[PDB]
Amino acid sequence: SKVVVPAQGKKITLQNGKLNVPENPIIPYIEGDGIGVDVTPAMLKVVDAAVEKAYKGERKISWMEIYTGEKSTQVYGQDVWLPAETLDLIREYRVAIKGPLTTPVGGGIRSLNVALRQELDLYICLRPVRYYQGTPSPVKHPELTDMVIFRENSEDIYAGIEWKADSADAEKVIKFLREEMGVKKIRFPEHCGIGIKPCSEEGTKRLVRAAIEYAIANDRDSVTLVHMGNIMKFTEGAFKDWGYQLAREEFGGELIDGGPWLKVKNPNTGKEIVIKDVIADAFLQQILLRPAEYDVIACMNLNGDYISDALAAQVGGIGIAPGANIGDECALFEATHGTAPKYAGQDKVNPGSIILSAEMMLRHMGWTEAADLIVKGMEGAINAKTVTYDFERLMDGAKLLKCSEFGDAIIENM
Amino acid sequence: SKVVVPAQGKKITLQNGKLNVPENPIIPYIEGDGIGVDVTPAMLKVVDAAVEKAYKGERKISWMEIYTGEKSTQVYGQDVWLPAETLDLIREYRVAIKGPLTTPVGGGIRSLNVALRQELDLYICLRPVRYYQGTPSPVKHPELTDMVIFRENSEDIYAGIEWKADSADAEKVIKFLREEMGVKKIRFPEHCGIGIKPCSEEGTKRLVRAAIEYAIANDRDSVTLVHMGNIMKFTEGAFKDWGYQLAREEFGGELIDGGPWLKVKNPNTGKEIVIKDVIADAFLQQILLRPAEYDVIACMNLNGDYISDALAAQVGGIGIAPGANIGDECALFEATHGTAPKYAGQDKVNPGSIILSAEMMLRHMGWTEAADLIVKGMEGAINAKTVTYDFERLMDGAKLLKCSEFGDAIIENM
Ligand SMILES: O=C(O)C[C@H](C(=O)O)C(=O)C(=O)O
Ligand SMILES: O=C(O)C[C@H](C(=O)O)C(=O)C(=O)O
Ligand SMILES: [Mg+2]
Ligand SMILES: [Mg+2]
């Protein structure tokens, strides 16, 4: 039992659908493997600057380190990549932030980030994606992208119910299917790997309610449901209709002229949030070709994964992209990139993802003013062309700063 | 039994791994629903011009119309969307070309294009994607994209083994899984839709052999295997390793320095084709950010679907993209877009996909010179800015030609 609690500090508390943030919250952070080691400090510093600038010394976060990944095997045991105690702690502390986690191949360990999302049941995975002025982009008009992806987390093929080809479990899921279910469309059973894709009504509805409710809450223009429903009828296809049914019975959506698009009024502003839908392979196109038609996006696990990383590259934000996993009893904000071992310890990586995820946490905790300062340090440093090797290698006349030095430059721009 | 055979003409013939094209082949073509009606003529004309220019009246294609879609219900019966006779005929005639097919909702009919791919077993779906100079693009450097996608067709989630939520078949595939297989990771069984994803060894190997063999045959630089293997271990993950194993035992690939990338020598040119792999969500990024690292791409059905349409938009070729479905006993080349009923009969659509698919057919039939003329009519007309509303609305000082008028402009540019 090896975490050392900050002695000064209090736990974030939940008062029935509200958080109760102390002035001094203890916030767990997993340092992160690989380059986790450079960005997590650049984040600790520029957020500790952020609450000291905004609440003028009245608020203070009590950082408490936890482990997962590779840092649990060098602390607990050579075989522990996710302690049970880590699960307890995100749950009790309510909020945690984390850098990148490596998952060993060769040992039975599923992707550790998905392991955390499922075991804690962080059903919403909220990944903003917008253009910061001056960010090097592949695209001609990156400023039309300002979208919000609510990839569902607990479900879809992405859960990992899969059995190895020519094992027994693989062998008799197929024997069951060929005989008992009468399945004819498996071309080759012999030496065939089988995966299972779930998509329930509850897991769909709960994700889409948080998608509509965020578009109400921030006076956004639309919630697009993305799905490859025209082939995946009773999973993706179902997510679309459930999505719609909840829009209609819970938020009272009106049919728009012939449909299936609905008009939900935004009760506060009286505006109309549109509820369209777009089939998953065309959506990947409409985001480079009509990016300004999209605003909030709701989708199942796999498509949110791809849609996110596609949209993140369009805005040159491969490593500036923030992201969270919000659940109902806790929320864990994360670096959306991997560990980089060739660059790790070299202090050259971009800490922008994790610092922008730290921004998403602070706004969630209610500390608006702190979060806002970090959003300006960020906009300032990047449009001041005083940047880090990934932007700089593509940015004319940029000054090259090390990861730390870029943390520094966000602070001075606050 | 309602197809009217061209009386003059001969069937394409297969002489053991070779086609035997008459001077006058009968080639079936399905006209195509919706706008199929404008493009299929613009294609018939600019290909009939193409063999008359190149073989100087010595060759002639005997067009034979067949039906599927909506045109089978108005010819055979109100309920027939794919006649059996259509399947016989692509198989006997060896080659067919087709425009867009609408699939009715409300009647049990799966996506008709996937219905054709499975029932005829057109396992390879070969979708080129390159930049034509002067094509309006969202991206800054579309000229670095010249890629070839071999999306596997017969398998993956895309086959459609799925059971409706709260039906009995859905209900006891889940009872089977919870009890007999010991599955714990379905968060919500109640009212859950289940899909099944197959990925065999044979269906993977056969697709990857045609991917390597095309990169040998055209002196391409690399075959990238794309897969979301890091979560889909015994399907996608397996496609990757099979892919690799076939590269290694069949085409004798060498380990490159530590791997898993292999060096296969191209026997003809003695060059080295590289066999890399890239995880499916990062691949969607590396195509806008390093497009020149990719050359041939091999992947399972679903990812080839998305990868294709994403890459097609990057080169402004949403409707210029060609594509085939090659099988072992026949090959069916197709318009890669939908039917457009708002624009249909208005003769304003871009026929470029279907005409470029007609080009891919002619080269396949061995008529190189004809295919090549169509590739120049195409390059000429578009860099002569004498184009159709989709390019024109984004192209300064373009002349606006109707679909027909653009077929015309390709001919005059031959
Ligand atoms: O596990 C990882 O590191 C990759 C992760 C996923 O596969 O779910 C990812 O890319 C994402 O979080 O979207
Ligand atoms: O059936 C269609 O019309 C869409 C088709 C698919 O879903 O397989 C497609 O988009 C493609 O052919 O790639
Ligand atoms: Mg991802
Ligand atoms: Mg498609």
What is the distance between the alpha carbons of residues A320 and A374, in angstroms, rounded to a whole number? 13
Give the H or E element holding residue B85.
Answer: helix B84-93
Give the H or E element holding residue B224.
Answer: strand B222-227
Supply the angle between the helices B280-289 and B301-314 in degrees, to the nearest 10.
Answer: 20
For the stretch A269-275, contacts whose Cβ atoms lie closer than 8 Å and that sit 24 or more positions apart, written own/partner, are: A269/A219, A271/A219, A271/A221, A273/A212, A273/A215, A273/A216, A273/A220, A273/A221, A273/A222, A273/A223, A274/A221, A274/A222, A274/A223, A275/A212, A275/A222, A275/A223, A275/A225, A275/A243, A275/A244, A275/A247
Cβ neighbours, 10 Å, residue B299:
31
Q: Which of B144, B145, B126, B129 is nearest to B320 (CA)?
A: B129
Whether the CB of A140 is below 8 Å from some CB of chain B: the reply is yes
Centre of ligand 2 from the C-alpha of residue B113, in Å = 7
Cβ neighbours, 10 Å, residue B282:
18
Find tokens 């995946």 and name the residue: A232
CB spacing of B201 vs A188 below 8 angstroms: yes
Q: Which of B160, B226, B171, B167 is nearest to B198 (CA)?
A: B160
In terms of phi and psi (left: phi > 0; alpha: psi -120 to 50; beta: otherwise), the region of B238 is alpha
β-bridge mates for residue A63, sequence order? A27
- Residue A130 token pair: 């917008």
User: Nearest 10 degrees: CA dihedral of A208, A211, A216, A217?
Assistant: 130
Task: Give the three-state DSSP class for B125.
Answer: strand
What Å resolution does this PDB entry report?
2.5
Of the bound ligands, which one is closest to the alpha carbon of residue B285? 3
Using CA atoms, how far residue A170 sits from B187, B234, B272, in Å, is 21, 10, 37
Provide, as residue numbers in chain A, all residues whose Cβ is less than 8 Å from the Cβ of B125. Answer: none
Q: Which atom of ligand 1 is nearest to the CA of B230?
A: 7
Q: Which residues of A are annotated as a binding site for D-threo-isocitrate?
A: 111, 113, 117, 127, 151
CATH fold label, B1-414: Isopropylmalate Dehydrogenase (3.40.718)
- Residue A5 token pair: 């609690």
Q: Are A50 and A362 in contact (CB under 8 A)?
A: yes
Q: Which residues of A are annotated as a binding site?
A: 102, 111, 113, 117, 127, 151, 305, 309, 337-343, 350, 389, 393
What is the distance between the alpha carbons of residues A412 and B351, in angstroms, rounded to a whole number? 56
The structure was resolved experimentally with X-ray
Provide, as residue numbers in chain B, all residues whose Cβ is less than 8 Å from the Cβ of A204. Answer: none
Whether the CB of A109 is below 8 Å from some CB of chain B: the reply is no
β-bridge mates for residue A97, sequence order? A29, A333
Q: Which atom of ligand 2 is nearest to the CA of A228?
A: 7
Whether the CB of B189 is below 8 Å from some CB of chain A: the reply is yes
Nearest chain B Cα distance for residue A303, angstroms: 9
The span from the first CA to the last CA of chain A, in angstroms, equals 39
Instruction: Name which of B140, B235, B238 is nearest A140 (Cβ-Cβ).
Output: B140
Cβ neighbours, 10 Å, residue B397:
6
Cβ neighbours, 10 Å, residue A8:
9
Centre of ligand 4 from the C-alpha of residue B215, in Å = 23
Give the H or E element holding residue B173.
Answer: helix B168-178
Q: Are A223 and A215 in contact (CB under 8 A)?
A: yes
Using CA atoms, how far residue A18 sits from A120, A349, A364, A365, in Å, is 19, 36, 11, 10
The span from the first CA to the last CA of chain B, in angstroms, equals 39
CB spacing of B111 vs A160 below 8 angstroms: no
User: What type of residue sits at position B55?
Assistant: Y
What is the distance between the alpha carbons of residues B340 and A273, in angstroms, rounded to a whole number? 27
The answer to whether the peptide bond before residue A41 is cis (omega within 30 degrees of 0) is no
Nearest chain B Cα distance for residue A110, angstroms: 7
CB spacing of B165 vs A284 below 8 angstroms: no
Query: What is the residue extent of each domain of chain B?
Result: 1-414
What is the distance between the alpha carbons of residues A192 and A174, in angstroms, rounded to a whole number? 9
- Residue A399 token pair: 């000054």
Using CA atoms, how far residue B182 sits from A34, A173, B176, B178, B362, in Å, is 35, 12, 9, 5, 53
Nearest chain A Cα distance for residue B406, angstroms: 23
Q: Which of B223, B224, B222, B242 is nearest to B233 (CA)?
A: B242
Task: Give the three-state DSSP class for A175.
Answer: helix
CB spacing of A202 vs B186 below 8 angstroms: no
Centre of ligand 4 from the C-alpha of residue A76, in Å = 48
- Residue B58 token pair: 């010595």
Centre of ligand 1 from the C-alpha of residue B389, in Å = 40
Nearest chain A Cα distance for residue B213, angstroms: 22
Q: Which atom of ligand 2 is nearest to the CA of B113?
A: 1
Q: Are B296 and B251 in contact (CB under 8 A)?
A: no
Using CA atoms, how far residue B75 sits from B70, B72, B79, B119, in Å, is 9, 5, 10, 22
Q: Are B388 and B400 in contact (CB under 8 A)?
A: yes
Written as one string, the DSSP assignment of B236-276 is: HHHHHHHHHHHHHHHS-PEEPTTSS-EEEE-TTT--EEEEE
Which residue stretches of A218-256 are H helix?
236-250
Written as one string, the DSSP assignment of A328-384 is: SS-EEEE-SS---TTTTTTT-S--HHHHHHHHHHHHHHT-HHHHHHHHHHHHHHHHT
Residues 6+ apart with CB under 8 A from A259: none
Residues near ligand 2 (Cβ within 6 A): A 230-231, 281; B 111, 113-114, 305, 338
For the stretch A166-175, contacts whose Cβ atoms lie closer than 8 Å and that sit 24 or more positions apart, written own/partner, are: A166/A191, A169/B181, A170/A194, A170/B234, A173/B181
Helix, strand, coil content of chain B in percent (nearest 5): 40, 20, 40
Task: Give the three-state DSSP class for A392.
Answer: helix
Find the closest chain B residue to A390 by CA distance: B289
Q: Which of A327, A312, A329 is nearest to A390 (CA)?
A: A312
Residues 6+ apart with CB under 8 A from A3: A28, A64, A65, A66, A85, A89
User: What type of residue sits at position A368?
Assistant: T
Find the closest chain A residue to B230 by CA distance: A111
Chain A segment 302-321 residues within 8 A of B by beta carbon are 302, 305-306, 308-310, 312-314, 318
Q: Which of A365, A385, A376, A382 is nearest to A411 (CA)?
A: A376
Q: After which residues is chain B broken (C to N over 2.5 A)?
A: none
Handedness of CA A168, A170, A176, A179 (dihedral sign): negative
Whether the CB of A165 is below 8 Å from some CB of chain B: the reply is yes
Give the H or E element holding residue A208.
Answer: helix A201-217
What is the distance between the alpha carbons of residues A25 and B393, in angstroms, rounded to a whole number? 55
What is the distance between the alpha carbons of residues A385 and B318, in angstroms, rounded to a whole number? 35
Give the H or E element holding residue A299.
Answer: strand A296-299
What is the distance between the alpha carbons of residues B300 and B198, in angstroms, rounded to a whole number? 10
CB spacing of A161 vs B183 below 8 angstroms: yes
What is the distance between the alpha carbons of residues B192 and B183, in angstroms, rounded to a whole number? 14
Report which protein residue has its CA nearest ligand 2's atom 12. B336
CB spacing of B197 vs A199 below 8 angstroms: no
Of the bound ligands, which one is closest to the alpha carbon of residue B32? 2
Task: Please tell me whether B340 is known to bind a ligand.
Answer: yes
Find tokens 């190149």 and name the residue: B54
Calculate ∠ Cα A8-A14-A16, nearest 5°: 160
Written as one string, the DSSP assignment of B315-380 is: TT-TTT---EEE-SS-EEEE-SS---TTTTTTT-S--HHHHHHHHHHHHHHT-HHHHHHHHHHHHH
Residues near ligand 1 (Cβ within 6 A): A 111, 113-114, 305, 338; B 230-231, 281
Longest dimension (CA), chain B: 70
Q: Are A144 and A292 in contact (CB under 8 A)?
A: yes
What is the distance between the alpha carbons of residues A312 and A322, in angstroms, rounded to a whole number? 10
What is the distance between the alpha carbons of residues A257 and A375, in angstroms, rounded to a whole number? 40
Task: Give the three-state DSSP class for A405.
Answer: helix
Whether the CB of B18 is below 8 Å from some CB of chain A: the reply is no
Of the residues B113, B124, B308, B357, which should be mutated to test ligand 2's pocket, given the most ligand atoms within 8 Å of the CB? B113
User: What type of residue sits at position B8?
Assistant: Q
| Beta-strand runs (E) in B39-94 | 62-66
Q: Are A199 and B238 in contact (CB under 8 A)?
A: no
Provide, as residue numbers in chain B, all residues whose Cβ is less than 8 Å from the Cβ of A280. Answer: 306
Q: Are B334 and B98 in contact (CB under 8 A)?
A: yes
Instruction: Name which of A118, A188, A312 is nearest B202 (Cβ-Cβ).
Output: A188
In terms of phi and psi (left: phi > 0; alpha: psi -120 to 50; beta: otherwise), the region of A33 is beta
Nearest chain B Cα distance for residue A42, angstroms: 25
Find the closest chain A residue to B154 by CA distance: A187
For the stretch A213-216, contacts whose Cβ atoms lie closer than 8 Å and that sit 24 or more positions apart, written own/partner, are: A214/A126, A214/A148, A214/A150, A214/A296, A215/A266, A215/A273, A215/A295, A215/A296, A216/A251, A216/A264, A216/A266, A216/A267, A216/A268, A216/A273
